[PDB]
Design a protein around this ligand. Structure first.
Ligand SMILES: NCCCC[C@@](N)(CC[C@](N)(CCCCN)C(=O)O)C(=O)O
Ligand SMILES: NCCCC[C@@](N)(CC[C@](N)(CCCCN)C(=O)O)C(=O)O
Lengths: 296, 306, 296, 296
């Protein structure tokens, strides 16, 4: 199985007067590349996929692809949808425009069954010839892709090689790798990056890496090298920032942090997302002071 | 300028018995003739409003144009009747929700249902700005829709009440949260709003506490019974409304043995009201067992034809 | 079926120098009797059953029975336990010492199965010849008596006549009365007293009635006569106090309120229960100022 | 800080004609000692603490202490209660009768506040001079000991040296050891034994070790010696039995499994606990066949 593993960053999408700041986007990706990241995930949840247009979604995948040219860094394009026909079209674009693989979030809102989830992902996997990573985040979607369903998709579909789990369920992470140790389990929750990696997980899709790419990449590579003592040391140091980056719904805190660090020019979201409370803004600023934030 | 005293300034409302319309498919396309036929069946069985392209209508898997087409069919079919059209117009992107509201307004809908943004989990402040933008975009009634099990977020009582008091067009909320405490909270602190049952099994408890209508899944199959229940309750004939609610519990529950609208479309097919049991992925046919369970609960109810 | 229904009070247990204030106990009960209450529940959750000795538990039931003699007010003695042998002994005491019935909470902590709950409650019901009201409160016990189990127990055991629900699950309350309308559904959550009664519930077991017995009494009796407009008005008026009385775990707020009203002489709990926060202490007092509190 | 760590067993309590089978109790403990176990926990949740009398509770601690005398295996006696006066009395007994330390579950059912939990545990720790391990299991108690409270108790009370966590919250376990790395985090959920140990947890209080003490022992010692690959190997191998041992509420499956393995004479519980369903009985049997069960 072709895989995409290692330290990965769920890229924020910087806005400038209600438009994608395409130049800042490429600059932010180069900063990720130059700080040891193994792959970038354009237009995921952290990238405000929901409020980007179809064309903007496609533009950011192209910017990510162009910027990682000449490096080893892969582009795991965000291509999920709660409509299978739409998710299939997004997978096909990502394949045809140079993405190395796709991240495909479990359908949100319409609550498909396990059978429907199976057919949803089978259709996506059959549409392309590049790796496909499932993404389970029941707190956001309202559904869950069961261990059995994930394992069936991994065994039945060539392209499906693992899952990004954001479910606060280390039991499930044992369950998955105990019954299908060949799959690539990817942490989708920064605070528990090390426990997932120490159980045989092979990478992270990180929010924190947007702000501290060197530390997340170092954490991941230590674990992948079975230096669990050094990996845990960074996970412990990062807990305070890992937690505060979710004091409000992601990506509200991480964008606040990127703005406070001078890495984006404006603290701009698209509704229904918004600036955090003044109190949480202040709390984010204070936590940041304990970490060394790389510039450009 | 903006002000905080809209609670008692005349609000156009859409209340009573309402149906979350299923969207029939035929060879992967919207069966538009069946759609209108189903709406006429609702009109002829005492329903007060229809909700095109909501959750039960598989809004998520319809194209933007199909979404718009079904609103137009709903509007056209309800012309000349007493039945209003509460068009599904929500989105988790505010830009998109605003455009959907504007379409519904410009194409004859009487109001819009606007579900809380799903998946991206806005804050209470974000939800406030989201609905303020929508309400300021059109001049037709806006019913908020809270269903946290599907969206991942909840519109708090405080936020709902703030929206009712701050925005002229926001007149109430459709609650699907299994939270009768919240329904007390809402109407005890802002009794002027229209609380709408979004959970068929608890239609009567919500109505008996001052709720003013239902947006029903069961009404797809049994429109006469849901409309009778609602009108009894609105007339304070709580004995007769509760009697129907209790009788409807078995079908009300089985219609969610799998994720709505999978069972209701199954039931509509078994009753001969739609010609094919067709969904759009990721939605699909139910299991055998649940198919049999739905068929078997249906045997207890008298299903009106066309 | 012999039943105990109507407006009922989960009595607080006042302490005085670490011992049960037996005179204040009787005085509080008389206050309930004189303000329209139909039954009292001695030594339930609100009475801090967990920290009373067997002798204090038994002493408090005797005080309730003695105080309601010659009145229309019944004693629904708290007699549950997570050990069936203990619950049987507790039921037998209440019967042999004049209680009109028993409330028996579902076993807490040890999480019996539905079969276990059935055998647990059958043993209790067969041990006595007085009514047995089940008590479902999953947030506290960690278990739930399913609708099927409650209905089976109601149909299989003569003396089991209903259930006190504290589960915030109005769907379940429809479920219960739609499929077994003969049972007595009792509200165990003050804020939703009216919704449960308006659906055919026949009483409440109230925390708020400790402080405002006349108001919970009028609410219940209005509703039982299908004067739903008057009952809903009191339920709506009571929401603020009904909610603040759970700003910390009951009975911490209600005992605080009883102390603030001068109805008990000490704000004394037994550990692990404790005084509320000073902030919540002030919040309870402010909510109370909006309500008409009867004296002795 | 005096500590009790390593591989520990929450001992089942076998019954014989409605009484504690005291001879089987000692033999089962002797089996644990002979398979590398570091300590035994008499009369915990798995030992049906809720339905034993005070004298049976006291008898089993004495049997545990006597049987581990002359060996290096310690006795961490179950001594919790939801009444602080009771929890102090049980702690005092355990010290006074030779236990090496006490496990004290968070008060169940009465839902103390964090302030109440602090005062509850402070009272327990001050009553004895032996180590005190907190036990957090919110699914059973209805309350949670917050990370702040655990750390505060650890820092303020000499005897409180850690916590046994049964909360399916690996985030909280990172939180605990990142902010207070000196405490002893003990796994209370067998399926996630390895992830908790690999993050710096120092032991387990196991249900599975009742049946497979050699495997749970090896798992813990592999991890404590930083052979994470071998510890993960047994954890993955043990998942099926770890999961099936909770298909019904613990200790219903483990006692069933011990009976099916011929390690106890009867499949006897105390109500409200009961035999499993025939289906789950069959499921436990089936899963067991894949594992090598040590005899006597
Ligand atoms: N990420 C780029 C496109 C965003 C589209 C959408 N906001 C909603 C997707 C949709 N299926 C659109 C249906 C249009 C009719 N309401 C949905 O709203 O569920 C999403 O995928 O979250
Ligand atoms: N209700 C009046 C007496 C209170 C008894 C007890 N505190 C403890 C009940 C008990 N079964 C006692 C077991 C003794 C061994 N720990 C329990 O704690 O589970 C409770 O039921 O909450």
């Amino acid at each position: 199985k072709n895989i995409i593993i290692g330290a990965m960053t769920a890229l924020i999408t910087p806005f400038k007067n209600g438009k994608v700041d395409e130049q800042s986007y490429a600059r932010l990706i180069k900063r990720q590349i130059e700080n040891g990241i193994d792959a970038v995930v354009p237009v995921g949840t952290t990238g405000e996929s929901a409020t980007l247009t179809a064309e903007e979604h496609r533009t950011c995948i192209e910017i990510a692809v162009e910027t990682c040219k000449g490096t080893k860094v892969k582009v795991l394009a965000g291509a999920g949808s709660n409509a299978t026909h739409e998710a299939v079209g997004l997978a096909k674009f990502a394949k045809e425009h140079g993405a190395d693989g796709i991240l495909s979030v479990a359908p949100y809102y319409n609550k498909p069954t396990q059978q429907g989830l199976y057919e949803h992902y089978k259709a996506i996997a059959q549409s392309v010839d590049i790796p496909v990573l499932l993404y389970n985040v029941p707190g956001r979607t309202g559904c869950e892709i069961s261990t059995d369903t994930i394992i069936k998709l991994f065994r039945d579909c060539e392209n499906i090689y693992g899952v990004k789990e954001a479910s606060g369920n280390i039991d499930k992470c044992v369950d998955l790798l105990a019954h299908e140790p060949r799959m690539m389990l990817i942490s989708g929750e920064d605070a528990i990056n090390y426990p997932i990696l120490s159980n045989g997980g092979k990478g992270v899709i990180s929010v924190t890496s947007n702000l501290l790419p060197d530390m997340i990449s170092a954490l991941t590579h230590f674990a992948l090298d079975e230096n669990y003592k050094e990996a845990k040391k960074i996970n412990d140091e990062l807990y305070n920032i890992n937690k505060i980056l979710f004091c409000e719904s992601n990506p509200i805190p991480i964008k606040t942090a990127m703005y406070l660090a001078g890495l984006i020019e404006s603290l701009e979201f698209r509704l229904p997302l918004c600036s955090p409370s003044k109190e949480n803004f202040a709390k984010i600023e204070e936590v940041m002071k304990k970490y060394k934030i790389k510039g450009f």
